Design a protein around this ligand. Structure first.
Ligand code: NAD
Ligand code: NAD
Ligand code: NAD
Ligand code: NAD
Ligand code: CDP
Ligand code: CDP
Ligand code: CDP
Ligand code: CDP
Lengths: 335, 338, 338, 336
């Protein structure tokens, strides 16, 4: 079976590609090498096995259509995207072209030239908006949603906030609708935070890795900022848990096609920024000092209620936050 | 004030444009003349007064950008769109380009070059999906929604169905988010069925108007036997063009208070009709028999769509004044006039 | 056989379309109705026969590709374009998108899905630049090219001047290259001035028609004093629509022998006119005095443009039959009739 | 002064960028890293100085416009392009979007927001067509243009052959017209073959480099093909002369704005593929074995630039001999 990974030299993509390579799956990677680290990732993958690398711009309809027609993949992980909320605010046009435009270029090519292709799309918890319709409590280290003790499920109201939220949300709904109307085999994952090796976090994207870099410099002598008070919460999912989800879901596509699933590390793996700092301090014997910025354009809490996916395919995260965090630290140091 | 109406030669657009002309508001109309009857409306508006007509394609960024910088409108009703669900299924790329691409072209131009421009966007009831999460009952002439007897409000779950639903839904969310993020003055109306003069209905767009045309044909002994998709018990509240005009202008006048919000708009439960009920109204008014054949029900369809308008009425205290009976009679008269 | 005419509701297109209708050739007209008068031409054509009218934007790849796949025409006259040099200077982007992008949209659709389609493209004399490399003399009524007494042939050096010249020249070259590389059956006509019925001239396009309009007004006691750019001695050979119809259809009938070539097309030296000469003809025909004011010469201009048509006459034996004096009188009459 | 180089990680771009860094010029590099070796060139340049690297797609109007408004360069070398004729035949759509669309994206941004920007465009000899209107002569090793012993000048008829010729040609004419119509400071170079370090030749583009490679591959024990008989000729211009040409032309922009110039190694630096093969064989003590394919599309039998116009304008002239540059190219290639 042929597997195509758009954005294959990115964090998620490179991790998935490596599994594909280890499983002997014929792999096609499509990326523009725009993310700092993508080139390194590509070099690393090449050291793992042989595959087809196709440089291309997801925004370009011709590039995308030729990719599909030429390789006719059996399955595809559509990860090429504009990933930062901050950049979407400064460059909404690019964000729209990449996330909405790129997704539609892929959907149209698939529909017209390769309709049986199984597609998994990485959406976001931002399609849910600010989540201010619920009530929260504030403790010493974090906020808590009184109404949704175990996280939010797919029945949560859609309300796209920020251009990134609107472009991913539009792509999300089109993915789901192409399954209904045109019979495409699509699957949508509304993802909460992810972290792991091959992630080249930045100030604008990859909060967990970013703060690890923070803890790393501190360690080698190099205040930083935090948006808001640090008590905002996100469930954190390690790359190892993401790989299993992708491949397992792909293998069960016939059963789950046409649905969206909330994906995250779950309540047990929930962390506030403050809580994340503790952990790092405690591992590296350090002190993370910072200044405050106003709250971002932001969910006080985001925890996925994964009953849906668990029930469908029996997947659950095996990597705990503490564990994954130390490993993330180790990897960051490694750079 | 200068008012820009994109899709200004269409059904809603020309009605709104006529009002602007009568009230001395300076008008700019932008349209590509693609809708059959658009040329007729343009001609009709031209005889009503003077205004700036700008032929253009909303999908074209340069056309849109130049329009905004050149005229710098104070307000704008963004009505240009791909309006047929059917067409959206047959040509999803076109639907996406016009509805999403075109809306973003306008948003970007206003954001960058004329940020104070007020914008009202004509969205749809299709952003709510099939609404099968609710409970229904089937009566003799219609389907009734048991737990939402007065229609649906803005708290209904968004679930874009059909490419038309997806394109209008994406544009809808972008309009709301631009108010939030970039401070634009936008308003979104999620509309249910509208009908009235200047509407040149077709098989796949303007159900009330199309069925009125079927009646006119029958009345004149024209054999062009028709169909309905489903059993005809599906319901929609219908809103007359006169009420649509008052809503747009009233809303505009209160934009400062309503900016950044979406409102479900419709004729309300009292003006709702199933196709079977519409047929009866026509048979009574015209002294005819509406014979038809049933086709399978539509791919994407809502058994019932009635807007609960508490939100808009509470904000601007606008409410529909034209009854379904009265409006449909008027509509038949207009149709027969063509 | 099906014939597709892009730009089918314009001046050339409507004339060509009408002939197809009369000869019973299956016709598809593709147009966006952007040129004023396009709707009138469309209505007019509608009164001559039946055909498929497809509203669309040549700049839009999807509209163009669908058009080809859906109708699979056997021949096509590609006339949709941005025709004004002034507009090309004020909006080079649009000019480029229409003329280069639109032509490429068509070329690619044909190449991939209907490679046998014969295509005739209407290029321009502007691909030859200012022509200042030749020598000229000036008389009391016009300029004359002393080294090119029979006009310019296809051997003249290409030098695109103006964005219009650049967009049309790029399309022209692509048309010819697609015949070479991809084996398409293309023919390019580098046209000099054309005029005739169904042409709704404006200040910016259709100089002959424009000045005829000026004469009608004066005739009719109307005052809209006008201008000319430069001294009025600049010359153009003028070709009447009647000759143009025969050209296109005769050429189409001989495509196999002429595919992959460019031909200079015009009324020829015998039909060359300067603006001053044109005024004189009109004053005589109408018994009026044509007063005007002179403006600076247009930046991008040819003092003389006359087509040396030996190549096309040798290939298909077509030659213009309508003289300038006779054509202009006819044009005046058409103009007055409007 | 700020210099923006589009296609800055490519062969010409990296060479020009290194020089700029050496002169202490504020540099902006724009590239999508599509060419194989681009990432390598980006890494190589990185240690030469500080500069701004902007990843972007020239096809994308938004990327290009933001680039111009954000950096407001004083000068620009527009090298981002679809460089292969072959590939243009296989993907004319892409060739058109990159060469024509990309160039108009740049010209529009400059026209509207940074109109004094000086721009040098790298066009091609392919805008001249097949050149069959001339008379040739075959010798044992090459073809000769009987009517143009010193090469072709700017007065040669324009006739764009191949989609690449059409796309580059349209962009070339637009560059010149924006100068006349909009007062832009543009210069067009109709370039014949260039080669040197930092060039990552492929089957499709970079003939001298490609064959050097061919040379390397063999010597290292381990067939290749040639399109036509190998007697076709090109003048070859080394990277060193290209660098001087660019910077000198840029410095003299006020006097050459709005013009096109044919650029090449000149006749003394002309080579046929067969002659190049000797070069290597000797220089390498080897035998270059190949199979023949049909002649490339519209391929010119002879392309030698008559540089009188440019020499008269800025007195630039190539100083690197083919023998010399080719040997060094060989050396450089073997070193990779
Ligand atoms: N990592 C997370 O925590 C998280 C949270 C939710 C959603 N997602 C989604 O998962 C997907 C992958 O995320 P990631 O963390 O690996 O990000 P990433 O930036 O590391 O990977 C994306 C890859 O896409 C490539 N790319 C970007 N623009 C492109 C374009 N125009 N054409 C082609 N390729 C292009 C980039 O070079 C990069 O290698 C994205 O859609 C992201 O929005 C990730
Ligand atoms: N009338 C209803 O019952 C109803 C229901 C809900 C939503 N709407 C929305 O209200 C708006 C107006 O609807 P309407 O009934 O007046 O439709 P309409 O078709 O009569 O009006 C749309 C107008 O836009 C023009 N247009 C279409 N594509 C264009 C393009 N690419 N560029 C420029 N102009 C273009 C058309 O020529 C036409 O004049 C649309 O956005 C529609 O989705 C209408
Ligand atoms: N009339 C002349 O003297 C003359 C001289 C040289 C070349 N030409 C060329 O001949 C062709 C016909 O010119 P004409 O005089 O009939 O002009 P015209 O304007 O009357 O006809 C062109 C038609 O194309 C349509 N059109 C324009 N933009 C379009 C778009 N984006 N999508 C679809 N349709 C579009 C217009 O609505 C118009 O009906 C043009 O390519 C023109 O440049 C004409
Ligand atoms: N090398 C020659 O012999 C020669 C001869 C004539 C003309 N030229 C022209 O000179 C220029 C540079 O040639 P070169 O040999 O250095 O080629 P090159 O391939 O090494 O350089 C072009 C660069 O542009 C980048 N690029 C390609 N497509 C892009 C896009 N869509 N957006 C952004 N960047 C993109 C590539 O990644 C590459 O780094 C080109 O315009 C070429 O056609 C070169
Ligand atoms: N440099 C940074 C990065 C992220 N953050 C915060 O980190 C939190 C989690 O990042 P996010 O919301 O973008 O992550 P996801 O929920 O998409 O995984 C947010 O409140 C960000 O504002 C921060 O304060 N400083
Ligand atoms: N020719 C037609 C048009 C509409 N209809 C139906 O009439 C109902 C209302 O039409 P619609 O859903 O397109 O109307 P709106 O909600 O957009 O106003 C739908 O169930 C259509 O399928 C029909 O049966 N026959
Ligand atoms: N209103 C007008 C229109 C054209 N003209 C001039 O008429 C001459 C012919 O117009 P043109 O060059 O656009 O015509 P073509 O050769 O493309 O048919 C040019 O010199 C125009 O500048 C004018 O002086 N006034
Ligand atoms: N792999 C190759 C590459 C080029 N060539 C020939 O080399 C000559 C020079 O190639 P070219 O004109 O496209 O120049 P460059 O852009 O590669 O510098 C042409 O006649 C090519 O067909 C060849 O025979 N085999």
């Amino acid at each position: 079976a042929k597997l195509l990974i758009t954005g294959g030299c990115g964090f998620l993509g490179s991790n998935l590609a490596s599994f594909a390579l280890s499983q002997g799956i014929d792999l096609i990677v499509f990326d523009n090498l725009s993310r700092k680290g993508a080139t390194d990732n590509l070099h690393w993958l090449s050291s793992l096995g042989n595959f087809e690398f196709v440089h291309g711009d997801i925004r370009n309809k011709n590039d995308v259509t030729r990719l599909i027609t030429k390789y006719m993949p059996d399955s595809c992980f559509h990860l090429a995207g504009q990933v930062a909320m901050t950049t979407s605010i400064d460059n909404p046009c690019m964000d729209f072209e990449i996330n909405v435009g790129g997704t539609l270029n892929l959907l149209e090519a698939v529909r017209q030239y390769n309709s049986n292709c199984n597609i998994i799309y990485s959406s976001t918890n931002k399609v849910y908006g600010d989540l201010e319709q619920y009530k929260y409590n504030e403790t010493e280290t974090r906020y808590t949603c009184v109404d949704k003790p175990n996280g939010y499920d797919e029945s949560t109201q859609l309300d796209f906030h920020s251009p990134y939220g609107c472009s991913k949300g539009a792509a999300d709904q089109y993915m789901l609708d192409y399954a209904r109307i045109f019979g495409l085999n699509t699957v949508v994952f509304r993802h909460s935070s992810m972290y792991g090796g091959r992630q080249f976090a930045t100030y604008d994207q990859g909060w967990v890795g970013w703060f690890c870099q923070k803890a790393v410099e501190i360690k080698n002598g190099i205040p930083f900022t935090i948006s808001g008070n640090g008590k905002q919460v996100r469930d954190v999912l390690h790359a190892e848990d993401m790989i299993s989800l992708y491949f397992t879901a792909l293998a069960n596509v016939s059963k789950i096609r046409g649905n969206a699933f909330n994906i995250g590390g779950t309540i047990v793996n929930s962390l506030s920024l403050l809580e994340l700092f503790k952990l790092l301090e405690d591992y590296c014997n350090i002190d993370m000092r910072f200044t405050n910025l106003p709250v971002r354009e932001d969910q006080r809490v985001f925890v996925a209620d994964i009953k849906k996916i668990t029930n469908a395919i029996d997947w659950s995260p095996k990597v705990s936050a503490k564990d994954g965090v130390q490993k993330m630290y180790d990897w960051t140091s490694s750079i």
